[PDB]
Amino acid sequence: TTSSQKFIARNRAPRVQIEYDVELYGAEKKVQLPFVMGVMADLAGKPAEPQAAVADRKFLEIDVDNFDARLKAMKPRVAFNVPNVLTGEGNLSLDITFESMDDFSPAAVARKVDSLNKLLEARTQLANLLTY
Amino acid sequence: TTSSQKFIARNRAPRVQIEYDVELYGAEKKVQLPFVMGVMADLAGKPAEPQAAVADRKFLEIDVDNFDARLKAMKPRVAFNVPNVLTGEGNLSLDITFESMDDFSPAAVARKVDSLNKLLEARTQLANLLTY
Amino acid sequence: TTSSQKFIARNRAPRVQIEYDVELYGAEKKVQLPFVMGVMADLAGKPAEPQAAVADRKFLEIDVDN
Amino acid sequence: DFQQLESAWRGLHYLVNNTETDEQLKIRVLNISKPELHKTLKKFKGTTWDQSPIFKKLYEEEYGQFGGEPYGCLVGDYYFDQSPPDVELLGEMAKISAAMHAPFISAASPTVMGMGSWQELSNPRDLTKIFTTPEYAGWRSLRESEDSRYIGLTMPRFLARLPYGAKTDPVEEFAFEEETDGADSSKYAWANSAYAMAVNINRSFKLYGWCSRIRGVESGGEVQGLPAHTFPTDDGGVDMKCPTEIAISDRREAELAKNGFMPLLHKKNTDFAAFIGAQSLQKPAEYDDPDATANANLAARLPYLFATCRFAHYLKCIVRDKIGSFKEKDEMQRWLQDWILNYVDGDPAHSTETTKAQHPLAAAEVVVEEVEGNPGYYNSKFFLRPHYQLEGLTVSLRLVSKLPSAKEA
Amino acid sequence: DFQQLESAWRGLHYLVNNTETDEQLKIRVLNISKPELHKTLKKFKGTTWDQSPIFKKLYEEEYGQFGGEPYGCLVGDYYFDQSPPDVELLGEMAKISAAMHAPFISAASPTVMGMGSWQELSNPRDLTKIFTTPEYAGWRSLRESEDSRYIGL
Amino acid sequence: KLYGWCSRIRGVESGGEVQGLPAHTFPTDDGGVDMKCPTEIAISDRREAELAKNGFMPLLHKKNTDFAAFIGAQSLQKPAEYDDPDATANANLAARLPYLFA
Amino acid sequence: AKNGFMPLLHKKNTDFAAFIGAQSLQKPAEYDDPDATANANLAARLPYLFATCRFAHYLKCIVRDKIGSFKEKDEMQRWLQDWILNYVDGDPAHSTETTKAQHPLAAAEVVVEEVEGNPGYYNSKFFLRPHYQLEGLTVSLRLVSKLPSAKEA
Amino acid sequence: PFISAASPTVMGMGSWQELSNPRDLTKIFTTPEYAGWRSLRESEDSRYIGL
Amino acid sequence: HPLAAAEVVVEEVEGNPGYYNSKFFLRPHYQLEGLTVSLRLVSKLPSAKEA
Amino acid sequence: SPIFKKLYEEEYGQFGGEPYGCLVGDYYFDQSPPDVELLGEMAKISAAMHA
Amino acid sequence: TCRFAHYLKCIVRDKIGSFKEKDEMQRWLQDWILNYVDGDPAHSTETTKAQ
């Protein structure tokens, strides 16, 4: 990038002009060009909002660092009716939005559905009750 | 570490400058590097408090000197129900926290449980009573 | 199976990186492949039930233990 | 629904966690449902395909942009059957992926075989007979295309996680049983196996700098650490659920690789599994000359197409940076000839082990021609011979009293 | 419960009292239950394993630190069976211990043999036949690893 | 002063040592006796090499001692890779202060 | 010990007990060349892995302290070659008792290679041959009228 | 040669107490925020600046 | 002595007396930067014993 | 066939299976048409699996 | 020959995907089959002729 020593050399040169230049016999530096892998997948199935139009979605870099931030940012959710085995009745409509990779575990699934949350809290209060 | 005699030598030198330097033919001092043994174990099972989060526990040096201080500092405890053979009834819930290596002995176990403490004190008062 | 020392080596390497690797001049580990002997025989002659249809019988390992 | 979303995020998580990401390796996700992708790729078809949201993102903003990322390999995470819409989607994604030099990888639905399970894969006698019917006319027309060599399909999907339960993967929040009695395949969490192929590609690049070895048992196509769910059965008990949906015999394997699939087959009684070969969707056409048939077969195999795609990325960037430098036909000949020749190992071709993976080419030949009626514009042809990979071997053993080669002569 | 804690502190006390500790020999204890160790080693797996509370302590602060203690040998004080969680824990501790060059030593549960006693160890005719079943697929896959030579049982 | 040249300004034993650093020891829980690090934080060898790759000169503090050192002196310049390994070597030498002082 | 355990067996009618051998969890793989099989078996035994681990600690510390010193390929060859050679007892290898425990290596070989395209960075290989330990012995006793070695010839 | 100190804010940190938090420092300098920084390091006159 | 070797190429500027162009090729003494070591437990030394 | 599936596919044809070695009939075969058929077929299978 | 068929099946099935030329396969098969042959001791041997 033409070292300022070259500016001093070509512009107003002292009788003694001393420059330092890196020695490369054949030049030709490496091309670099990292390997990127674009991934397309169906995420946030049945969202609650219109979400985003195409061509505005882009491709978002992902890694182990932002993964949970990519879930929480993308807000993947699921809403469906399921038979209620707890107290007869019929289909139970549940709405779940997973904000972390741990939210697919059955514990977090139980904590997100409000009824199963009340039952799970009941169990933690009784199991915590049997021990002092 | 460049003896002050070297400072006197290089900085303003007398015509006669006398320094003392240790003679090492081949130099190359020993690497030292003591042998440490890291130990992982389950201690303070079922603690009474949240204790400490991981990555904040670290590794604590232990030896014959601080061993009891490591128990008393760590506060290992045990809480469970046990059948009561003393007076019919049923399960007896005992809470024990061991502050010394001697607290695992059956005597100290009896002294820590309050009922067994009353019985043991009764026995020491009667056995101490039979002798003057 | 690429020892974690190799992960430390290729991923973020200390200036001093010390790995241990087993020395095999010619590699080429042995094929193993034990000798199995399949035996076909008429057993449970005239059973009381329909027993089992073919292709569901399989081959069952036998020895002095079982 | 929960199994679909869970499998999506679980597969993506597998790809992310099992990849060593740095400056060199990146993973970019685009969330687009298969209906939305088929829709937007249906809006622009024929002439207008050069203008699409997907083509803009994949080609313009990166491979077409100055100083961008040529995007490497692409992973579909979709299940494609022979249906008209899936044949259209594969045709279009083959056009895009072919334009950007970015092989497309996805999973083949169990419905391609007129099956819907992958538990029935052992039932048919001949898989090559399945694809003859007119039902597949669109499929055959797709495989015959020259742009389909950029599409791989991995039919079986590996097991994502081990079923929750006291014996395996206890939840520890409350006593929990996941049911999931033996097989039936509907209870288990199945991650797409396009992600195992993807992990193999990223691994291949991280280690060797190239995607050349992404196949084979011991050549880098191994999928390890698969969840092995062992449940007791009658009598002796102790039989484990297969990590991939079903066991594929070598005959089934070769028969699927002939049909343009990438089977993931599970090693018996072990959590290990591997891709024996990577064959693109393209059916290579036979030719009179055996050399032309060889060149036609090489193009259908992903291990080589990754090499040529990488050379396309490199050449794009380096030539784009060389635009404007004083160049004659001879100057371009020396620069291209000496540029391609540092990825070729000339002296050590027969005796080498890992460098054959790092140098993908056994030889390279460049023919440069200046476009007539124009200065500064040239046409070039790169003939690059890849390192061959063992594909199959037929052995006839002969018990011989007198050796025919030496003893008998 | 009392037998478990008593055995833990009694074993540690045996190790401490029977060791001649000086400048050269040190013993550092970390109290972490087997569930907590499997949990924290489960949070970071695959790529993220280089970042872990256990890997930080064992490798970064000592073997990786300038002028630290390379940590020598490590002692598990846990009973590992062929179960999925114990195979995961052994895999991870084999990665760490392999990275820091610190052999991992622990005890093998009586349940590895499908036994639960060690009083029945004389009953089976052949122990090599026990590990053939698919139940041990994870175990065999662990022993085949190159990082498992750092784990004694 | 010692050698007439600035050639050795790095390394633990090669003259890049920073000695006599103030060591502030304050009592903590249990055994106590832990000292404030003289440099703001301890840098592992992995962090050190990772900073020297990014064109920094880390000052890392030796554990449990008032000693500290510069492991390497790397200028801000990111040396570019070249085809010829000799050109890459010459490109790396220029990015290191010990030589640029010469 | 074939299954990768370290049994503690108790001597009969005595309070004594011992570890007969220390075998890591790793199942050493067989190879075509018996030398490769030997090297594969040595790696699975903890007594040797402690040696190589210790050399890893030493090398880490001493090289980390040697960073920044003027070194060529030949200089590193002499320093590593002469550093590893003080843990090897060359003259007394057959006749020694306790020093074989203090010097863990019967021989040592260093191959140093400078990384191309970079100054001051080197790659080294340490080939160190440990002192073998008696593992097993099969004896066939033969009642012989005329000694086959000397009497019969 | 110019010698100075690099602020804790180069890492998007502001402490140097957090230097152990990030997993990869080489990823910090990739963002477009550092475009000027990368353009500086690529210069041939930057070999005269230590930090 | 910072240099292991030194090489000078002098060239006189054409079209001018008394003005010259020079190139100084000076090879510094290398400094140890890093070292990767792979230790191998070996039954028969590959360099000498095995040959 | 059920027999060919078991003998060849699940073992000699399977990846990481047991090539099945030798097979033992435990039957008494005469020259009758059915026994000649059975021997012909078992010779095809056993010939295919090398058992 | 059946045993050699089993061995060859397993080992070649595991070698699928490795870089191989005609000469490479010649050396690998030639040197693989040659460890089951005793060349020097063919006339003088007893049990190894069985092994």
Author numbering:
A (entry chain A), B (entry chain a): 4 to 135
C (entry chain M): 4 to 69
D (entry chain B): 90 to 498
E (entry chain b): 90 to 242
F (entry chain P): 295 to 396
G (entry chain b): 346 to 498
H (entry chain P): 192 to 242
I (entry chain P): 448 to 498
What are the paper's exact sentences on this?
The type VI secretion system (T6SS) is a contractile injection machine widely distributed among Gram-negative bacteria. Bacteria use the T6SS to directly deliver effectors into bacteria or eukaryotic cells (Cianfanelli et al., 2016). The T6SS sheath comprises two proteins, TssB (VipA/IglA) and TssC (VipB/IglB), which form tubular structures similar to the T4 phage gp18 sheath (Leiman et al., 2009, Lossi et al., 2013, Clemens et al., 2015, Kudryashev et al., 2015). Upon sheath contraction the T6SS fires Hcp/VgrG and bound toxins and is subsequently recycled by the AAA+ ATPase ClpV, which binds the contracted sheath to disassemble it (Kapitein et al., 2013, Kube et al., 2014).
Here, we report the atomic structure of the TssB1C1 sheath encoded by the H1-T6SS cluster from P. aeruginosa. The 3D structure of TssB1C1 was obtained at 3.3 Å resolution using helical reconstruction within RELION (He and Scheres, 2017). The final 3D model of the 13-fold symmetric TssB1C1 sheath has a helical rise and twist of 20.2 Å and 27.7°, respectively, and presents a right-handed six-start helical assembly composed of discrete densities corresponding to the heterodimers. Side and cut-away views of the reconstruction show the 13-mer sheath as being composed of non-planar discs, each comprising 6.5 heterodimers for every 360° turn of the sheath due to a 3.36 Å axial rise difference between units. Since 12- and 13-fold symmetries are present, and given that all known contractile systems have 12-fold symmetry, we assume the 13-fold symmetry of the TssB1C1 sheath is due to sample preparation. The TssB1C1 heterodimer within the helical assembly of the sheath forms an intricate packing arrangement that is organized in three domains (domains 1, 2, and 3). Two β strands of TssC1 (β11 and β12) are joined by two donor β strands, one from a neighboring TssC1 subunit (β13) within the same protofilament and the other from an adjacent TssB1 subunit (β1) in a different protofilament, but within the same disc, to form a β sheet interaction (handshake interaction) at the inner layer of the sheath (domain 1). Two α helices (residues D117–L133 of TssB1 and S66–M86 of TssC1) and a third α helix (residues E39–E54 of TssC1) form a tri-helical bundle (domain 3; Figure 2Biii). This third α helix is in an extended conformation in our TssB1C1 sheath, radiating away from its originating heterodimer and interacting with an adjacent heterodimer directly below that belongs to a different protofilament, but is positioned within the same stile of the helical assembly. Our structure reveals key features for T6SS sheaths such as the extended TssC1 N-terminal α helix that forms an inter-protofilament tri-helical bundle at the outer layer of the contracted sheath.
